[PDB]
Write a protein that holds these residues in place. Sequence first.
Motif, mmCIF file in Angstrom:
data_model
loop_
_atom_site.group_PDB
_atom_site.id
_atom_site.type_symbol
_atom_site.label_atom_id
_atom_site.label_comp_id
_atom_site.label_asym_id
_atom_site.label_seq_id
_atom_site.Cartn_x
_atom_site.Cartn_y
_atom_site.Cartn_z
ATOM 1 N N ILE A 395 -18.441 74.301 33.192
ATOM 2 C CA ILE A 395 -19.638 74.933 33.732
ATOM 3 C C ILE A 395 -20.850 74.455 32.949
ATOM 4 C CG2 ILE A 395 -20.826 77.111 34.138
ATOM 5 C CD1 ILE A 395 -18.011 78.420 34.285
ATOM 6 N N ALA A 396 -21.637 73.567 33.542
ATOM 7 C CA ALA A 396 -22.878 73.109 32.941
ATOM 8 C C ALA A 396 -24.039 73.930 33.494
ATOM 9 C CB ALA A 396 -23.072 71.615 33.194
ATOM 10 N N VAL A 397 -25.262 73.560 33.130
ATOM 11 C CA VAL A 397 -26.464 74.248 33.598
ATOM 12 C C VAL A 397 -27.010 73.445 34.774
ATOM 13 N N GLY A 398 -26.767 73.927 35.988
ATOM 14 C CA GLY A 398 -27.151 73.242 37.200
ATOM 15 C C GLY A 398 -25.997 72.617 37.953
ATOM 16 N N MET A 399 -24.839 72.484 37.321
ATOM 17 C CA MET A 399 -23.685 71.880 37.968
ATOM 18 C C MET A 399 -22.434 72.321 37.230
ATOM 19 S SD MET A 399 -24.076 67.926 36.681
ATOM 20 C CE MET A 399 -25.823 67.868 37.070
ATOM 21 N N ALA A 400 -21.289 72.100 37.866
ATOM 22 C CA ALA A 400 -20.002 72.444 37.286
ATOM 23 C C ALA A 400 -18.977 71.399 37.701
ATOM 24 C CB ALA A 400 -19.551 73.848 37.713
ATOM 25 N N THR A 401 -17.793 71.488 37.099
ATOM 26 C CA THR A 401 -16.685 70.592 37.391
ATOM 27 C C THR A 401 -15.429 71.420 37.610
ATOM 28 N N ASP A 402 -14.614 71.002 38.580
ATOM 29 C CA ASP A 402 -13.310 71.618 38.843
ATOM 30 C C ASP A 402 -12.401 70.516 39.392
ATOM 31 O OD1 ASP A 402 -13.882 74.193 37.971
ATOM 32 O OD2 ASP A 402 -14.752 74.742 39.914
ATOM 33 N N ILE A 403 -11.637 69.897 38.498
ATOM 34 C CA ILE A 403 -10.769 68.777 38.841
ATOM 35 C C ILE A 403 -9.326 69.224 38.625
ATOM 36 C CG2 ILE A 403 -10.171 66.414 38.367
ATOM 37 C CD1 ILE A 403 -13.038 66.097 37.216
#
Lengths: 706, 631
Positions: A395-403
């Motif tokens: 979880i970043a600031v403005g975007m996230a990742t789920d791989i």
Amino acid sequence: KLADCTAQDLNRTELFLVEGDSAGGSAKQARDREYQAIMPLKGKILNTWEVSSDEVLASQEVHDISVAIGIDPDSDDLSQLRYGKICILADADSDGLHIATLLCALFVRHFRTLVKEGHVYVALPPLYRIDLGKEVYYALTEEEKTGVLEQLKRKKGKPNVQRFKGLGEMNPMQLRETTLDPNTRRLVQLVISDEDEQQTTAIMDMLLAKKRSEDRRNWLQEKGDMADERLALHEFTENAYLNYSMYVIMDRALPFIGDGLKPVQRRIVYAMSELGLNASAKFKKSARTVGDVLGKYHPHGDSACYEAMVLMAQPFSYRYPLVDGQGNWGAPDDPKSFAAMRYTESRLSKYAELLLSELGQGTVDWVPNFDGTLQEPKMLPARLPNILLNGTTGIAVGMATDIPPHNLREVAKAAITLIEQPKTTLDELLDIVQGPDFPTEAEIITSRAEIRKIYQNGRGSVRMRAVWSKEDGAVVITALPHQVSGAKVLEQIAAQMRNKKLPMVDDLRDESDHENPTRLVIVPRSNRVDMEQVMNHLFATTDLEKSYRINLNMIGLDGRPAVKNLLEILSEWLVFRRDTVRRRLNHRLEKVLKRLHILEGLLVAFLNIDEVIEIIRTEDEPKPALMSRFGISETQAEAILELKLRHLAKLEEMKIRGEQSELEKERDQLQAILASERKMNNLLKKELQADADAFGDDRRSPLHER
Amino acid sequence: PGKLADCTAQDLNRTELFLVEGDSAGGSAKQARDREYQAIMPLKGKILNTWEVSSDEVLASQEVHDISVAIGIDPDSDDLSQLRYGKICILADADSDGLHIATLLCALFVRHFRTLVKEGHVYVALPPLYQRFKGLGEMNPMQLRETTLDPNTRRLVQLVISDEDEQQTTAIMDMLLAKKRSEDRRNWLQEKGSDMAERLALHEFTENAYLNYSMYVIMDRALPFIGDGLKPVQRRIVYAMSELGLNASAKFKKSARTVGDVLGKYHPHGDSACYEAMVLMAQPFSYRYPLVDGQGNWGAPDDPKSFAAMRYTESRLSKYAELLLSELGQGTVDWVPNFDGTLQEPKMLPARLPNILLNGTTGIAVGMATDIPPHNLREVAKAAITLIEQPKTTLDELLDIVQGPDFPTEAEIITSRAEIRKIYQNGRGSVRMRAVLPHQVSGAKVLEQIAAQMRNEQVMNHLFATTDLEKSYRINLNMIGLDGRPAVKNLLEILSEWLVFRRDTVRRRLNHRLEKVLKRLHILEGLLVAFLNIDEVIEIIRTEDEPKPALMSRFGISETQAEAILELKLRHLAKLEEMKIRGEQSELEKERDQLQAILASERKMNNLLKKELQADADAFGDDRRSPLHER
DNA sequence: GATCATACAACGT
DNA sequence: CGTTGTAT
DNA sequence: GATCATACAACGT
DNA sequence: ACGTTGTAT
Ligand SMILES: C[C@H]1COc2c(N3CC[C@@H](C4(N)CC4)C3)c(F)cc3cc(C(=O)O)c(=O)n1c23
Ligand SMILES: C[C@H]1COc2c(N3CC[C@@H](C4(N)CC4)C3)c(F)cc3cc(C(=O)O)c(=O)n1c23
Ligand SMILES: [Mg+2]
Ligand SMILES: [Mg+2]
């Protein structure tokens, strides 16, 4: 309360909101208790932007701030403000800015009157502390401040430079002169102009608005292309939260496409290999492991890192774990039931070699660490696409990742068949890459075509469902979906009975033991009870069927975050792998050459041992003599002088000639692969299948395709 | 209820509650327990000694209170009907102080739950250690099962007080847990100083387990060693900081990494307990002669415990530490393996000054304590030298030089001269200081003392007797002597016994250097013989099958010399590299005779010690800070 | 040595 | 009654 | 990353 | 509105 102050001069009194408790204790020991106060802010504070006045007072951190400030939330009344200057000092991290960004949110969304008059102040903490004898110098940026301090080094002695990576590392008196003592204090006055009041509110909105995350994605996409005493809060708020939004997206939360790791993950894996804790070495206490990670490479929280090393060692959090440990590393019912680092021993796993074996072959870049004393790798030479094998969820600031994780043998064959046919389309890749492979035996029920969309658009969700039999009429669950606790799934299926929602169920039992990991029995009252129908309810009620959102966002080779699809991820990794082997080959060739060059110089000495030894004793500096009288090179001459009398025997001449024949053949083989683009591929097509042969396994999670 | 993980069953005949020692050990004991009939309850830290506590005081301690609620019976309540569990088994770590956690649990099960232990409900779990030592909280959950939980392979005992041993079970336990009967435990230690049973006696186990702790603390935790004047928690920190290269000249390293190495390598105990000790060494205002230097917030005189976390502070060894480690590489001290058996640690440290009196220590063992005040460097040094030159020196003659303690403060010592003469002649007593503040006296604590006097030359005199301006300091010169047993000694005994240690560590330093010089000289012969006949050596190496014996036969050199010759490098053949070799021979020849002359002559030995105790006091000589006159 | 409240995106009930 | 420094 | 409570000896209030 | 998920203070 932790703030104290004697005087009550509304124009002289002054409050300081330190970031850390350790820093607060040092700031209080040196502050001027006559008219200066101090109150620490344990951890990060609430985002008081979209919080109601009742909620702002309900959060401990903001509450105490509201009481110490004197003013009430959303009360345009400053008739009982305890302190004149309400100062906010935090350390120069990207984190402290975030701490400073949301304190402005508090002092803006609620205490608008406080900042309007210009009482909110931010302290400028020092970066470096260079000193030489009776001389103390402090810096704020290595480009301008530290450069001049070190430039004026015309005085005797070697200066000492202390890198203050945080105010917690400063001494009480050392912190008094920098940000407390007004004489040598640097401090800016944050103010919201009357003309720019409409913009100061618009900027902070999209920065701290829970819902306007899409606006920030476009914001960072624009500010990144063109990235290059009293301050205006309008300027401060945007610059502070940007240096954080980027810091998190890059160096905290999103992984790299090549090694598929996060910096805390990477620095952890490297620091274990460097500590000698490979798959064969005896386990070492997790403390020293994390002591080295933080002590050398990753300057952040102790507990925060060990939590990351736990997930890398759990066979049920990662599909292909990177770490193997001894001790209580948690259970599936609750991953967080794990023992302290001082009790748990750890080491690297067999699968970790695919990330570290090729580290010494100059296959990777190297950037200095935070203090500059050591050298750490910017990435790791992954021999398989770890980005897809273990996956991440950040979880970043403005975007996230789920791989999601994937099978190793299914990705390898997909990588092999993409270099044999570079024109391979996505539909052809799906014939081999079948989908997510979780560390569970629960069936993935998502439709085949629905997966194609997920691997073409880079987004979407898949759903898992538990496995179960009907042994003796009673239903018995055999395996649960990923990240689903048995205790939790049972408690959900149990609390329903108490709420009279399942009057046909007789009992629920948890028969999990050593032999059977997770056995959950569900007995109906009568054999005539339609347990087939009872289950279709529990799937849509309990965690027996859990969805999983997929967001294939990652830092691409180009150094930028981007949402790739399956083809873009594999095609772009083979660019990464083909380039490291290219570097791995040239590295060996570079050393074989330099070896053969030494060897030919040695043989010359053997064929002229008489003159050499005579030149050594009949000359002050033999190296120039040995180069003119033989044509040898300075590098070759040094090696001659280092020959031991033992080496003058005939056998050692035969050994030297032995290498040169072996190496001469090795030299030609390398030159051939490097020069031939077809041979280069045949190597990759070989090493990939070889790695799958020694690290691949069967597919855990079936796809329900009968 | 509490944090006790209850079991599903409720049969008072088949339920059992396990009181683990460690919370992390309880987390692993909860994964591996059989959730049907097994229940565990953690006991964070050590519990309160309820042998002296009242019935209402027993329910005040949150630990003991939860034990009472979980057990079912109330403190000192005769009714035994309320028993939520059948077997009350205790699981403590094989640590010596783990057996202490067990003994304290017995103090309640007897003084407040007598009928419980009498009915045969208190049980003991015998933890195996073997896999390394494998502490309870460190072993694997499934591993902890097969050792303490699974009844098939479980090793547990049945603690029961015999009707005949009832009166003894009470009298024995009394003096062991009597806060006031501490002198009796001292005499108990002197008179009292793998096979097991399936059902042991609580009275026999109460005096056995508390003796282990009573000895473990007196030896390995509290009392220092006469030689280096350090406790194990202190000694290990110093060594591990050098082994990590944190010398006086090296750059500061984050204390977190330092403490971590001290624990994982050598010292298997608490982390904050280790860091707290290291700060007591680094603070200039706690030790007169600190052993550690550091950057950051290392406390303040007003509150020593206001210091920064080990993760933010960074420290290194100080110049004063060099007196303990300079001679560590010349085979001067003994060496013992670490706790897990993978590395080695030093038993002693080669102290070049009597640190036992320079810094002193303040410890609290079982049955005996320790209170050694610090002393001056140039004074304790000028006393040791004068003791060598005149072995028959008396304490009165010694007091002419060593005036008394030396605290890290300018406050004057107001104790009389004749009173100090009794301190250094008996090994006990006290001493008094008066502000000009005294040692360990906070500036904020005294102000609050005088401020409370406001709410409810001659003025200062009244303030010295009321406020903390005038404080007292206990003195007890107890320590582990070189004879490996605790004993209270005085100045004329401590200094004399130290010089036996210093005259032995230096004698080992000399013979260690002598053994190395003779080995080098032996090599330098075979090398000079080669330079004198290098032409033949080369022919022998190139024209003979195996040179090693050949070079031995011809030149009469030995096996070791012929190997050194073969290892010569072609650049070692020029004229210079023979002059460099004849330089050592003429240099080491001087040392080979000096050492042999200094080791064979007891008179030359003392001249070295006297000259070394003097040259060492030069660079490390700080004049005292606390005046000393009667008042 | 084990509690503790926060930011952050964004999908499920 | 509260002091001190290592311990769970 | 700060905070809680226990032991243990024996002198000073 | 609630509850996650995992690196951060
Ligand atoms: C920043 C510090 C202190 O605050 C922390 C937490 N709280 C719980 C209470 C809450 C508060 N503001 C009321 C006091 C903040 C927390 F839950 C976890 C950590 C973990 C780490 C680490 O991993 O190092 C850490 O440093 N801190 C933590
Ligand atoms: C033994 C463990 C856990 O219990 C500890 C403490 N408590 C809190 C209150 C007290 C209790 N009876 C109510 C539970 C025990 C405490 F205050 C400090 C430490 C310090 C260290 C260490 O330095 O490592 C440590 O390990 N532990 C500690
Ligand atoms: Mg910081
Ligand atoms: Mg232990």
